[PDB]
Recover the amino acids of this structure.
């Protein structure tokens, strides 16, 4: 009773300022569920799970009830020119569905599940114990020249032999694998699905097999392994969209060790954000750290793993909407893109600070980027864009080229907007640029190639999809990727699930068609990751 | 712009729609009925159950659990309570049967949402009353600043500066509502006070008359404020912790300018699950590194917030035990001895090696305040704490160097008057150990304090009738917090009576245990915490 009188006083919170959420249009269970289904299928990507807004404006009841039924129906129908699709004019949704959507967004956002240690441990499985795994490579595959290709809609990945151009193994994974990363030893392949399911594959077994699996959230995109000297196969980190968090695991077994929330304050307005999605993650070579990108808040986190029991995190402020990125030629500066801010942030992994914020074109999408030595400007890092056809060249040498350090030194022009990946190699004199999401079929079905020994000359259009000889379907071409020795570039002809797809290989020295990989199992090929080039960050 | 970026994010979310739940199936209640219940909730239930009803000292009152219990179960539990900390709202006749029904219906609805409080709101509340350049260069008064006391006048929303030697009120200043604590800056010039409403006030003790130079509001609800104490950082930064929103804020220690706000929402130490309301508790400034040691309650984390580079903040998260509350330094100012009250443990944080040294098992609901340090004739240097759940006083060894066999062990135990204790106190020059019993259900015990002889710890305590000595008449007259003067010969107590009744500050001669003086004033409304300037600034306890 002592402890009851002790916590007996009134809260300092004014009850009048604590608000009841309602005044929404009545809808039955059948009507609400149909609407909720359309929301996660068509709208959550841009508006967020909690509707607080990401690429899209906030769709919370305070804002939507203010607009009213008619406004909302009209906006969902015609869309806007600033990136909001027309759901009615395009005939994607019916008048009835749009009315249900307008009604839905006026209600309190339904609550999604959380995912902590109990759920993570429950999903954790060690298929082959470390003690019972091989001691050496029991197969005769050229592992450094292997490719980890994502078979998207099939929820699988295929290991394609670089030299023979054949599928060696097809493995069951999580749904729609986003990326593939290698461990610092070059033995373990790590893949993560968008469903946040991670699979660890031992390339040393007679036939490459899965040794462990875990689910780190409801939705995720990135996975990474420790790369600092003395920490080979020590830790594995993964970043989640829902819940806004990241997880550090044991690099041998995938045992969940630490989970850290990314819910916090923004860099720009310094206000609370309930859904800061984790984007790109890159392992530092300078300090025993993981460089984690937190999107909506525009924060770059340096997560130290020297002591994972008492975690040290340095929160570097950058720019809103941090997405993808990669290392400069020297592997010290993390060049990441803050896409909706139309900027590229430079993170010094050595001095542990923001070196600069470089203004580029509309919606920069570098992937990991493309590094080469410019004849006039010295070492540069490049990126193409989704919002326009420009290619930005940024100086990456503060030591021997201060005049050009962190400056958008020059621009190149591609086929158009909708570009996703730019690529080059140390042993190559070519620069490749795709145009995957470009509204024109011909442009999206081809890639642009520049001559690094003559950047004044226009690019050469390579008819990648046409060379594949596939027939019907959108046949969008995505991601240029080189092999171990850098003499051939691979492309994915991403066609629909019920259609035929292929991987097209081009001879880098001659710009001619070298090979075409077709297989009935090659369903919806997206990302391709060459083992050597991924492990040693060769871009 | 356009169509390319629309297909790029055109794919479906990996989230299963079927798993995202719609909340309702709650009893229909009108606006007047909902607001009447919501009023009672924040007045009587929020402290223990939390603002979002996810549970703190109290169990979760989220729709999933309450709708499962049903209307009748809820009405019965709110009426009779339980023996595990849940009050009997109906049996005691505190709430009417009609109010209890409204409450039962209320907790079955989705918890209403409070506002957030970020930088726009903080800057809007930020005021510089006297600019640094316009402030004095020397002390413009004849006040004995080191021996001044900063007494909280709770319900009045004010503080009072009482001269240690004369026993008179020098100045009454308008502050935030119900000031929780007073802290001094490292220079000894500025007095920092924070209200439970999260309003901070910075007072210059060097002006003609001690006046306010700056103010700011760091949240909707708060408890702690602190200043940077590492060498080379005098008056550099001021930090404050909030209950709602779950956050802390770092400000300029000269102007109170908001620089950084950090969310404490995160994963727990025990279950490693997400918690949407981790309240900030005690904050203490490190002398070993340029850091602030912040306690995060519900998650049970002790954060080492480095302020060397305030633009790129570095935080080290140390796991301790759930329900971290109050604490203080050991005799050497190296080990932060903090209580995880509902876990019945005292955590030891090494501020030098930056790690958890131990988790000592103590009694029921430890409440140390800042604690009491003295050298035990047998066990060596110790740190003590009294309890709310029982009458025991735990003595914990704090010397790993010369007494490793006793380090981080509940070495011995002393017995007080009973439960409901809040503060234990001693001083270097003193051979006495004082312990209050503020919240003890018996009137006579709560109106008195216990005193132990440090020279002969085997002997039983002496009872000092503090409230009786005050001669105040009617009222609860609960006695709270023993605090010494700079010399260590006087021990002050607060006779915390009701706002409409008469209160007093009782001073005792430590050398003789006899009544020295009584401070009465019509402005001395609901006195609670008293902080001696020198003793607060230099952590003398
Ligand atoms: C955060 C993130 C990364 C960086 C991780 C890293 O490197 O650590 C990444 C990388 C990638 C990479 C890495 C390439 C590389 O060379 O590094 C690939 C192949 C890729 C294929 C696609 N991505 Fe990706 N991608 C997202 C997020 C991300 N993608 C999205 O949220 C988005 C906008 C919407 C979505 O529906 O997922 C999106 C669209 C796409 C696609 O449409 C692609 C072509 C097919 C798909 O499955 O969704 N993303
Ligand atoms: C977090 C916290 C601290 C440590 C801060 C620090 O040192 O940095 C503290 C310290 C304190 C101290 C510090 C004394 C010291 O010497 O260190 C005092 C005087 C004090 C007066 C009270 N506290 Fe306190 N107090 C709370 C929280 C805290 N109190 C509560 O949440 C609680 C349980 C409920 C509430 O109503 O706020 C509570 C009850 C009380 C009281 O009932 C007191 C007596 C009167 C009041 O105004 O609420 N608390
Ligand atoms: C991204 C590729 C989008 C998808 C998928 C959907 N929306 Fe969206 N929406 C998006 C943007 C970038 C904007 C901003 C518009 C602007 O011109 O600034 C919006 C806006 C809306 C709004 C209006 C908010 C307001 O102004 O009050 C609504 C009502 C809206 N969007 C609804 C919505 C629904 C229900 C969708 C799925 C069926 C949907 N959007 C998809 C971007 C994108
Ligand atoms: C702390 C000093 C309390 C105050 C003030 C209130 N409650 Fe509480 N409550 C508290 C505890 C420690 C517990 C646990 C009881 C146990 O024996 O374990 C509870 C529990 C409840 C519950 C039951 C939850 C369940 O098991 O389903 C209810 C319905 C409840 N409390 C409601 C409630 C209301 C409405 C109050 C204010 C008018 C209130 N509590 C205050 C501690 C404390
Ligand atoms: C992915 N972009
Ligand atoms: C305060 N206790």
């Amino acid at each position: 009773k002592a402890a009851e009188q002790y916590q007996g006083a009134a809260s300092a919170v004014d009850p009048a300022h604590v608000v009841r959420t309602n005044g929404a249009p009545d809808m039955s269970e059948s009507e609400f569920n149909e609407a909720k289904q359309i929301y996660f299928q068509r709208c959550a990507g841009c508006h967020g799970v909690l509707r607080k807004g990401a690429t899209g404006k906030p769709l919370t009841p305070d804002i939507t009830q203010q607009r009213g039924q008619q406004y909302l129906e009209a906006l969902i129908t015609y869309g806007t020119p600033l990136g909001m699709p027309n759901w009615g004019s395009s005939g994607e949704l019916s008048k009835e569905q749009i009315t249900l959507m307008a009604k839905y967004i006026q209600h309190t956002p339904p609550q999604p599940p959380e995912w902590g240690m109990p759920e993570m441990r429950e999903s954790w499985k060690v298929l082959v114990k470390p003690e019972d795994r091989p001691k050496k490579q029991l197969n005769d595959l050229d592992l450094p020249n292997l490719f980890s290709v994502t078979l998207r809609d099939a929820g699988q990945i295929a290991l394609v032999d670089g030299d023979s151009k054949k599928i060696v193994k097809v493995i069951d994974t999580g749904y729609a694998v986003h990326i593939s990363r290698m461990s610092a030893s070059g033995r373990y392949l790590l893949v993560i699905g968008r469903d946040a399911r991670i699979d660890m594959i031992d390339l040393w077994a007679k036939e490459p097999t899965k040794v462990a699996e875990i689910k780190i959230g409801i939705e995720a995109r990135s996975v990474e392994s420790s790369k600092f000297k003395g920490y080979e196969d020590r830790y594995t980190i993964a970043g989640a969209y829902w819940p806004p968090q990241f997880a550090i695991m044991d690099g041998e077994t995938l045992e969940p060790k630490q989970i850290v929330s990314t819910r916090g304050m923004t860099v720009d307005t310094q206000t609370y954000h309930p859904e800061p999605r984790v984007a790109a993650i890159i392992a530092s070579h300078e300090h025993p750290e993981f460089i984690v990108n937190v999107k909506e808040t525009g924060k770059v986190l340096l997560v130290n793993y020297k002591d994972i029991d008492n975690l040290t995190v340095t929160s570097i402020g950058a720019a809103p909407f941090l997405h993808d990125g990669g290392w400069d030629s020297s592997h010290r500066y993390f060049m990441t893109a803050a896409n909706n801010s139309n900027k590229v942030a430079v993170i010094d992994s050595k001095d542990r600070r923001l070196s600069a914020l470089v203004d580029v074109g509309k919606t920069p999408h570098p992937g990991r980027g493309a590094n080469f030595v410019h004849p006039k400007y010295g070492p540069v890092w490049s990126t193409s864009h989704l919002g326009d056809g420009s290619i930005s060249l940024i100086g990456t040498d503060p030591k021997n080229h201060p005049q050009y350090a962190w400056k958008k030194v020059a621009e190149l022009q591609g086929q158009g907007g909708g570009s996703l990946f730019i690529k080059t190699h140390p042993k190559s004199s070519h620069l490749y640029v795709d145009t995957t999401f470009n509204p024109d079929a011909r442009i999206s079905q081809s890639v642009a190639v520049f001559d690094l020994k003559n950047l004044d000359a226009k690019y050469q259009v390579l008819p990648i999809a046409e060379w594949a000889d596939l027939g019907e379907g959108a046949k969008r071409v995505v991601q240029p990727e080189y092999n171990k020795r850098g003499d051939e570039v691979w492309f994915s002809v991403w066609n629909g699930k019920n259609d035929s797809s292929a991987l097209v290989v081009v001879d880098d020295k001659t710009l001619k068609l070298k090979a075409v990989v077709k297989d009935p199992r090659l369903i919806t090929p997206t990302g391709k990751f060459n083992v050597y080039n991924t492990q040693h960050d060769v871009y």
Summary: Chain B touches chain A through 92 residues (CB under 8 Å). Residues 115-541 of chain B form a domain with the Methanol Dehydrogenase; Chain A fold (CATH 2.140.10.20). The first strand of chain B starts at residue 127 and ends at 128.
